[PDB]
Design a protein that fits this description.
The chain has two domains: 135 residues, 3-Layer(aba) Sandwich (Glutaredoxin); 64 residues, Ribonucleotide Reductase Protein R1, domain 1. By secondary structure, the protein is α+β, with helices and mostly antiparallel strands. The two termini are 30 Å apart. It has a five-stranded mixed sheet with strand order 1-3-2-4-5, sandwiched between helices. It has nine helices and five strands, in the order αββααβαααααββα.
Length: 199
């Protein structure tokens, strides 16, 4: 069900306190231009204000739309620690101008990111060819399309981090590029309600 999808799942990669008052789930493609800009110019302030401070748990879920993006999503699984995983995705977003826009199968950018992160070639090769991880990524994506109605990215779901609650997914949904003030308004208001409920 859509509700069961909008909670922290066993295989989710988490950033911040698992018991934070607020939850943000983001679906995005690593090769999506607006996504990249959001991650470059808005997300760092969200992370500093809300994630580093323990106010909000952040769960990024892959939504790849092309060869580069799917391979990048697969490669992210070579990064186990929460900060390493986030930092890998951040690097891919940051380097969007550096893909090969003519040969869409050219993964030189990922080789560069792998080298900069001291990922060995054998580990790199295994990750970029891991059929089991590919399957998981594309199935998580199709599940989101079916149950959450995702067509365009990015999409954000922002809600109380309470596993017992029911809410219609569209009521907590935010789509596209949003400036910092949009998110601070949404998150501050929700956080206030959260603290009141948490006594």
């Amino acid at each position: 069900t859509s509700n069961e999808l909008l909670l922290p799942l066993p295989n989710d990669k988490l950033l911040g306190d698992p018991k934070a008052p607020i939850l943000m789930i983001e679906y995005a493609s690593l090769t999506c231009y607006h996504c990249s800009l959001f991650h470059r110019n808005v997300f760092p302030k969200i992370k500093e204000k809300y994630i580093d401070t323990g106010k909000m748990l952040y769960i990024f879920r892959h939504f790849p739309l092309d060869y580069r993006g799917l391979k990048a999503a697969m490669l992210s699984h070579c990064y186990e620690k929460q900060e390493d995983y986030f930092n890998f995705n951040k690097a891919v977003f940051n380097s969007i101008d550096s893909w090969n826009y003519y040969n869409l199968s050219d993964l030189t950018l990922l080789q560069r990111i792998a080298a900069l992160s001291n990922l060995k070639q054998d580990a790199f090769n295994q990750c970029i060819n891991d059929k089991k991880i590919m399957d998981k990524i594309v199935n998580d994506k199709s599940l989101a399309i079916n149950k959450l109605g995702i067509t365009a990215v990015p999409i954000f779901f922002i809600k109380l981090n309470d596993d017992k609650s029911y809410i219609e997914h569209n009521k907590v949904k935010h789509g596209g590029y949003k400036e910092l003030k949009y998110f601070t308004n949404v998150i501050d208001k929700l956080y206030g309600k959260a603290i009141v409920k948490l006594e």
